[PDB]
Amino acid sequence: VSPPPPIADEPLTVNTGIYLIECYSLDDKAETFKVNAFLSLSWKDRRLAFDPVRSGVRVKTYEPEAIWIPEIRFVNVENARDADVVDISVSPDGTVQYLERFSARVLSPLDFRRYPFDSQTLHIYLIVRSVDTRNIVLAVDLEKVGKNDDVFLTGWDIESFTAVVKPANFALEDRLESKLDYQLRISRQYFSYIPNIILPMLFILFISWTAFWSTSYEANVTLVVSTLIAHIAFNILVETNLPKTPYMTYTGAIIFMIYLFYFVAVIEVTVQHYLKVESQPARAASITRASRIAFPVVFLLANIILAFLFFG
Amino acid sequence: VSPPPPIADEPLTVNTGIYLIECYSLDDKAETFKVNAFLSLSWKDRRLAFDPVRSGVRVKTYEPEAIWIPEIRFVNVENARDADVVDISVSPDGTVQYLERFSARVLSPLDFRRYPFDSQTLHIYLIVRSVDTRNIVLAVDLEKVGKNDDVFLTGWDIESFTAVVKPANFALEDRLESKLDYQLRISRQYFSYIPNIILPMLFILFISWTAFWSTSYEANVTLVVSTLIAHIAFNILVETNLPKTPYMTYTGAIIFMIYLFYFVAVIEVTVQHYLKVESQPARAASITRASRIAFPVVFLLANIILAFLFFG
Amino acid sequence: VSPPPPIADEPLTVNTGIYLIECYSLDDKAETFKVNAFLSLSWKDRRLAFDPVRSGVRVKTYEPEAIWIPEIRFVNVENARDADVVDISVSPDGTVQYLERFSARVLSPLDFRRYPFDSQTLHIYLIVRSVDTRNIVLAVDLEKVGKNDDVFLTGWDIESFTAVVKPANFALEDRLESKLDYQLRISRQYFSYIPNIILPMLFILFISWTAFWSTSYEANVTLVVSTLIAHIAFNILVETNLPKTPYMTYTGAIIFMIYLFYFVAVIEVTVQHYLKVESQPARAASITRASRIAFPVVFLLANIILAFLFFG
Amino acid sequence: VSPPPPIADEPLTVNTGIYLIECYSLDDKAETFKVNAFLSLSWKDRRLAFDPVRSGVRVKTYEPEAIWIPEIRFVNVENARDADVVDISVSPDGTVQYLERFSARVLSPLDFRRYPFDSQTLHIYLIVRSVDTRNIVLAVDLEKVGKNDDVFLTGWDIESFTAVVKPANFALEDRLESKLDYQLRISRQYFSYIPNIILPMLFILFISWTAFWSTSYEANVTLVVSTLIAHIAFNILVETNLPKTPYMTYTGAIIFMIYLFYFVAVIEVTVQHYLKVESQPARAASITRASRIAFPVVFLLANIILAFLFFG
Amino acid sequence: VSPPPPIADEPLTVNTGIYLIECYSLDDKAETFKVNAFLSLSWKDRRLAFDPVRSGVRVKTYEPEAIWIPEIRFVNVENARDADVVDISVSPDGTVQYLERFSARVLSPLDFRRYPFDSQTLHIYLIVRSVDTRNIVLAVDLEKVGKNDDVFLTGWDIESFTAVVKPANFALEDRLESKLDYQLRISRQYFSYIPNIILPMLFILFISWTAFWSTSYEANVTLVVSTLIAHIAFNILVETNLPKTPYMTYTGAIIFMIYLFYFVAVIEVTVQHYLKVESQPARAASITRASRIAFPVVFLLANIILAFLFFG
Numbered sequence A, B, C, D, E: 001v002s003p004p005p006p007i008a009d010e011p012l013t014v015n016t017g018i019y020l021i022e023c024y025s026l027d028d029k030a031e032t033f034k035v036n037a038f039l040s041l042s043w044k045d046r047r048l049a050f051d052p053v054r055s056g057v058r059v060k061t062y063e064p065e066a067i068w069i070p071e072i073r074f075v076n077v078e079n080a081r082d083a084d085v086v087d088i089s090v091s092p093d094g095t096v097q098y099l100e101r102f103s104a105r106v107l108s109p110l111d112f113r114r115y116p117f118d119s120q121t122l123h124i125y126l127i128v129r130s131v132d133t134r135n136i137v138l139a140v141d142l143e144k145v146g147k148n149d150d151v152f153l154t155g156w157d158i159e160s161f162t163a164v165v166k167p168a169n170f171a172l173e174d175r176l177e178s179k180l181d182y183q184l185r186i187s188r189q190y191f192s193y194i195p196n197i198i199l200p201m202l203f204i205l206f207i208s209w210t211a212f213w214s215t216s217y218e219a220n221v222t223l224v225v226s227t228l229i230a231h232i233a234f235n236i237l238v239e240t241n242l243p244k245t246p247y248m249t250y251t252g253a254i255i256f257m258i259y260l261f262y263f264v265a266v267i268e269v270t271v272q273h274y275l276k277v278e279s280q281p282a283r284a285a286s287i288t289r290a291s292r293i294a295f296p297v298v299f300l301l302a303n304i305i306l307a308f309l310f311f312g
């Protein structure tokens, strides 16, 4: 029909609330996730008021095509939501209760500066456009905001799901808008990365470092170059999960430092052999004896400094 | 139309049953499977009752748009089911029979603690929301629960398909709900993993262990490091099927233990060569003679202990 | 409208036939293929009969919404077919001709026991459910079963497309059903597997076997271990096409036998070097001279026995 | 309505034409491409004729649901086209002009005998089925066949887009059909394959051939076996683009010849070392001196013969 | 209804404007991106004019099915846009305001000559077809062209979004068209390619170059051939992102030059060993001493020349 007339030019208030039923398919590369939830609306149309004692009923049921329903839209979705109407009810005073169940695909940026040990906030924006004869604003009904106890995200820990009460009001396309923000806080589960990636890589590194207790040039070359090939295959497996970012990240810095260490170890081996050939064995012995202690300490200090820089 | 009036404020009972026709596309990473089944409903509307001897017919056929049909929904599906109506029939006493065929995509968590030798239970939840003038509850009709003899899941053995008779009743969004649980028990087929993964890996391990019967440092390095590269490529192939979990699993523990063994073998080779160079051949001979027996026994004991810890 | 009345309680017969237009997207992992075909129906409604000489026309054309059309369904499809109606015509005696063009996705198990040289049969099932006032049965019209001369499946040779004349009658959900089976026989094209997989692998095997004409331990280790790495990469490429089965297959047995051969060759090399070091050169010479002949003959006999076991 | 009546039992002619707007997503494995084009129809209905000077208009506009429009279908598409109607106009004499814009997915076989330097023809078939009271035939209107100047296929050069004027008439399902063929000729862009695949492979081959200027058995084994591993990784990368064919192809023959060359080079190395050990150095020197020239000449002659066999 | 009548045979002008809300899924291989935006239209229908003081309202609201709306289409989209109507309003003078929100998939070529450091322009074309009784032309309304502050493309920097004011007028299918061009300028974020690809490759190159400070033929072969295997795996990882082009590109030229360098280094090693064996040590010493300086300088000069050729 037509939007409800004002009595003294007041804004119409619409009370919202979202109840989460499902959450799945969080994609890091595309920065998307799928949702399945309820949507609840409530407003007041004085034209719908009835007498209870006369009609003999306290509650009225309507079809969606018989009354005026405001148009509420999601802002950061790919296509329009797929929704069906659950129930419409009207109170004797005039207030109408609206409920529907929908599904949608949401777009939301992510931060990867602490990739294996990070936390993300996901947003859902709701907007409504005013009409030429009425002003509409949004409100939050805290009795209708929640989630199911069975909601699970594969690889994440859900912490909270709250709304910002204050809406943002502005002008878009020569018309006034009102916007609402729903937030969902999550935490990555990082247990499996330790014995899957971290410890095997340290094992390969320590296996490469055994070249400082040997004096055979050929076995030293084999050791180092083959451990480097294995490092490359590990890096290639790891880089498939992380997308490209315009800022430096923890894992990338670690990987670059590992390459740098392999380079310096090759240089040390080559210098040792060169000095040996040139009949200067004492100098090569002292250099390898120094390197034996120097490499792990500098590795440990580099790692401590990096962890303080990124997480402190 | 309108929900059937109560006679003395009693709850309306709706008898359900699901007959499985197809089951396919079980995805471990996304924890989803597709289904194709029948759905059967039965209730009583006294307003539909007729006389058999008068009309001259015992059974009445209606369209779906001519009578009141309760709204039944699936809880853990991605989008609403695609369904068509097969037949609607009404009995002379008032009972109506409903049948439809649907397709849907279901979400269900999985446990991977015994990944190659595990068993899964899959759930399907059915819910119905009460109306403002009547209370609706769900019941199970055991004469209409079953599956086809041609249902096949690629890589799984189907065991049973039963329902829990007792429904769960609660309040959601200031309205009463009733929920039903259907369970499907399956078992992985694990025959192919043995000669495909398990035995070749043991072959590579035993091939790496031949370095305790040799005294050549270069061939020992080649042997061990190349077998380690092959182990890495096997692990990389295997890790594509298992998703990330927040708990320890059998396969991951085995793989970590294999890396640990390779590390210790490199250390043994290096110690042997170092003692040989230093003119202490008896000590190196005794160490390699000890290691020859020590490695397989400790492997076997570790494996027995792990298998008792995970399956016992 | 309503199903055609019986004259003396006889079953209504419906004559079917499928004409294939397209066949594509045969997926081995998912055991599915896509189809595009005609569907032809024919039955008799005495209520439609007219006089030819009166109306002045011999053939009558109807819309699909103006007459009763039986409901025919496909049993092993994922979702309901997408179909449109081509023509409906009625004969003066009462017989009606029905034609439509559809598309669907079909599910059908496959056998992989002779994977590179196998043959498959694909099934399509058609079912019809009886109504409360009439019994319906299915028949096959052999004048309307065929395929186009341009039907092509990428990698397969189509042999025949026939129907089983006798239908299967049973009771489902307290109602009678009738089912029909359409079969399509195909054969894999195996020419490309020979110079793509088989011969290169034999080349690598023969290249590994050159270690019995050498007495250098390091080159022998390099030869064998590197050929084994190449075998692993070939196996990893091959295993992507075959899905997991619960029975043994020809290719898997060949691959396991190849691993076993590599293991035994490593053992032979190690024994040879060990005996040489221990100052027993005659025994090592005799062992390598024996192995030179022993390996290819045992390979050939194993292969003959396996081929007789699987194909004989 | 109803198909236009004949005057003296003549066939109705329908003039067609396709104007290409877009062409994208050419898939070699699945032998499919997507299209976006116009479709133009023209015929004569004497029942639509009007007087221009009376009505005061020269052109009449109708809705698609108000007149009879022939049913035109595409033969080698996966699903029915998605189309919308652009304009319908009628001439005072009776001729009607029809225009629509559609999108579709087309199936078309490809030939790969000259894979990097091949040319393909793509077909689009149009069919129409006669009715029980009229015969319909197809014609080509050369003033309405063309393509846009912005049509681009990623990796192909478009040459021409023409139609065969003569239609093919036959009987299908006891009814007459008429079929039309549209052809689109393309050519692969082969510039990038040279410095991406061809030249690096020749570099690896020439690097393997340096073993004829050396007398060290271990470095010769390392050289050859490692170059063979690199050849295998190149072949594995290349084989992902080409599908399986039942005939021999140029690239596959080249790859098989490369494997054969590696085999023969390993044999040469082994024979050389064997003769050296046996105290026959002159014979090994002469054999390696012969091989130095023999290998590249036989490679070049083999390549010339293959190129003449496939392209001549 | 019917298009608005001209007063003195003038063209109808339609004022357009696009406001960007979302931009995502830029695919390099397929040259596509997804968009979500507003669309604004404005024209004048004298038949809609009313009196404000009489009706007592200044603004009129219509349904989309009650008035004539011009047909506007996108030219380089895959399928027709998914759109819904937001508001329709009419001014007392006769001007009508139109707004809608749509989603579409756009096709647009890309240039890769400076792949890691390139900039792209993306186009969106709008067309309208004239009718048989009126001429329609397009105009640009600069007060309705813009984008949101939250628009983000994963891996790109958005610079501007403007329109070309002058439309292109021509004749298509014997009817006049008008076309408009919207442009969107972007820039790749290239920070992550440096420590991810560029520097590790230089490390491997410098590690291969250590063979000019050694006189052991076997370690030199191991060094060079293994670094070449690592280069091949890096190239294989990199080539998955770039599609095939018919012109030369910066990255491909760099990669080819790296292969050429590896070839020449193998040749140098082989010549050195050959001269050493032949008892000419001074000549081999001088050659390796020359190569030590010659290789990096020629690399640096080649790189400078290439960078000037492609970016200067």
Ligand SMILES: [Cl-]
Pocket (backbone or CB within 6 Å): A072, A073, A074, A077, A079, A080, A081
């Ligand atoms: Cl929405």
Ligand SMILES: [Cl-]
Pocket (backbone or CB within 6 Å): B072, B073, B074, B077, B079, B080, B081
């Ligand atoms: Cl549902």
Ligand SMILES: [Cl-]
Pocket (backbone or CB within 6 Å): C072, C073, C074, C077, C079, C080, C081
């Ligand atoms: Cl169906």
Ligand SMILES: [Cl-]
Pocket (backbone or CB within 6 Å): D072, D073, D074, D077, D079, D080, D081
């Ligand atoms: Cl079509």
Ligand SMILES: [Cl-]
Pocket (backbone or CB within 6 Å): E072, E073, E074, E077, E079, E080, E081
């Ligand atoms: Cl459009």
